[PDB]
# Entry
Amino acid sequence: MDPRIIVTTSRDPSTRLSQFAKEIKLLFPNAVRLNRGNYVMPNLVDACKKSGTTDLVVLHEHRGVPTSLTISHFPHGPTAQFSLHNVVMRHDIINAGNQSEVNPHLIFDNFTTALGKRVVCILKHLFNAGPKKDSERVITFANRGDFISVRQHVYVRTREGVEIAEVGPRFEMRLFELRLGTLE
Amino acid sequence: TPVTLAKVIKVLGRTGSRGGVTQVRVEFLEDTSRTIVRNVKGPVRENDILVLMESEREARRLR
Amino acid sequence: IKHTLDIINVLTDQNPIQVVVDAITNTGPREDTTRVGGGGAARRQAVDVSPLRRVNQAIALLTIGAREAAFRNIKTIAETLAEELINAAKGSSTSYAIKKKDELERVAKSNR
Amino acid sequence: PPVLTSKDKITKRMIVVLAMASLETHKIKYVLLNDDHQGLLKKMGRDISEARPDITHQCLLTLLDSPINKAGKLQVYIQTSRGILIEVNPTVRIPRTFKRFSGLMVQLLHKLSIRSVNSEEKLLKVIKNPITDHLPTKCRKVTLSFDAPVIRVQDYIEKLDDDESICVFVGAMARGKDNFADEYVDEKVGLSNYPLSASVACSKFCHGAEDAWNIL
Amino acid sequence: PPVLTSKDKITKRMIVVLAMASLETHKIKYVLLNCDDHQGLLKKMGRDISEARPDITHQCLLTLLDSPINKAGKLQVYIQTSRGILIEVNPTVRIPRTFKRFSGLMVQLLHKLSIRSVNSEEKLLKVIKNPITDHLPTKCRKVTLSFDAPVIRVQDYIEKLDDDESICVFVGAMARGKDNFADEYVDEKVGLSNYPLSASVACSKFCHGAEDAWNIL
Amino acid sequence: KAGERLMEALDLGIAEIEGLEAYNRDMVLIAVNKTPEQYIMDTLLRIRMSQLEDALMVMPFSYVLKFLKFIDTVMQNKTLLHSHLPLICKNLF
RNA sequence: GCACCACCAGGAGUGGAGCCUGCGGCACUCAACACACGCGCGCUACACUGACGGAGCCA
# Structure
């Protein structure tokens, strides 16, 4: 039911990709860090089909626009590639706050159910790690048309005051290539 | 020099501070059937030969 | 090693797989110390090292200290590695390897 | 006479570690934190035992002017209160004053090395902890202390072997516990029934070694 | 141990005289003239600037007085300037550790002729009269340490003394110079090493060599 | 710690029994009871029903020699009021 | 129970010189004495496993 997520980059990460992969590692009890000794193996289909996993995340960098995230659901094969805003130097965080088994509440703003809805399913289908389903933190997905923003906040009540807690990195992605997948 | 040869028969658990010390019930070969409990350091499996330095002394637990 | 097992076949014949194994055995520390915390002041505690580690440390001190001695001199890797295998297979306390075995045991004995 | 480096571990020698040294800098062009600012310590939130360069200065004028260093069997390692670890070349000239001493310690602590004025040599070096990385292979380690029992230098150094070196650990501070090397030694040693300074104790170990090793 | 004075001319002890000490005053406030802080001002007087080295004598005071042969009551320390002003050191005085505080103490000693507490009338630092022989004991050995002089062994030389014959040593408190500063006093000039030593190294050499001799712990 | 509770407990109880053994024919305030052995069995009931065998297999032969004396003590004392024969057989076996 | 900011085992980086990339901001061991720039990543050198010359040969 809950997915099994694998994270992978090119053979040459620097520090700025290392800490970034450390933040992306922080979506566990099902997020695992792993490099390849080739750049990207073409046998990853036997890797995921043999391992039985469902989803794959790839970090790389190209020069059509700058740096790129890639998400794919493995057996069917839809694959969204997204573009990032900032990869320069994020926070060196690998675990702080709670654990990532805590399923937060999930917020989508600026409802577009015309053609971004396939995205809104996948983000629902990704972040259901853990048996919690009871909110301790919160993750925010802000549409601004084709600009989205990512937030992580912790509930800080004070004298029954609903104060947010900014933690972790602040992302702002754009819809890059989204390949029309299959029923296969 | 009293170099004593002992033999692992059964491990107990993992104790000690830094997490390498296994309390191991040993039985040394020459003049057998007289058991001692010591503190090993590295990886220890069953039926391995440990070399005791001193022959009559025992401790159990490290914080 | 193809050169070194010629040199050991020349110097003191002793078919040179002999001189390796004795250098494996006679450099192993028969006991060791660990850094137990205890609260602030770390006591060291005399413990008895597992024989998988006695194999592995014997590989370590030979290959490191030979390259240390081979650093900045006329002799090469294979020649100073030939020195370490002869001087440790017979316990002579002249090599780098034999000296480190006794220096650990004189800590564990001093603190058992 | 050959010059001793840390690359060799074989030659039997004498090594002194002036540990817990009082080396702190301050901005107001950096100076050593001391006469000059003895009344500006708590006013800047600093300590009194941090204001003592004369102890380490007088121990360098003690050790580096000894005959046994001119005999060439001496190495000096200096360890501050923060853990800054210093190799001192036996051919270095200490400036006999306080001022060039102060500026030379500032340029040492911020350039991390003071290289040769004549050749391609390091004169003063900063190295990594532990101190056991840079001492000879078979070496006795002791600590001079008032509260440790009195021994003589000469007979005790005459217990040493052909290769067995000696390093001693000296507290170059104002006062406090004699426990700065509890990890390191085989032995706590003493020299007198009276409370001893660092420099006079270092001199007793020097000339005790010179009467021990037939150095005149 | 009772405090050793110049009035005791019988007891076998160790006497050290630091001769030709650079002790000179100056009005600007009275200061002690050093090479560092009064360089061009000593150039104005037409002097040898390099001899203005009170740090050597300070280092010999902290070297001699902190040794346990002072603490045992066998040691006595005297100061003779280059101008010959003779100062007896009380064997229970505590010399300042830093150069500036010792500088001010030498200022008040050279201007007040006696440094004392308000509790004690026993003078911690006293100005007395030449020659040194009127304050040395009757049975006392007089030597000058010189590199030009033959080299002896210290423990053998003290073992070749008599049962109450003392020993006084002359150290020229200077950076460079000859040993002819006190030839009118001495019995012998000896040496300590094959190397040219400083003053404080020779002082600790005969201190701890004498503590090896009289077996003082 | 658990086997150290057992070894400290047995060194205490045997340390008192040997003291009372040479009473006058050869002419510690607390563990808790009038006798320490009522301590000894009840601490056996203090530890839990699962994986106490790990606490037993730690303990060497000296634990056995100091151990069986409390068994003969409570089976001469006819105390079923603070332990029970299933516990005694369940441990001794 | 679980974890490479949970420890023991070890390895590998930055942090020194240079070059740029992006980003940021503008009382006393001493009575007496005297008290504009920056940060971090990549890139380039210093090694004596050294030079120089050939010949062989694998995606």
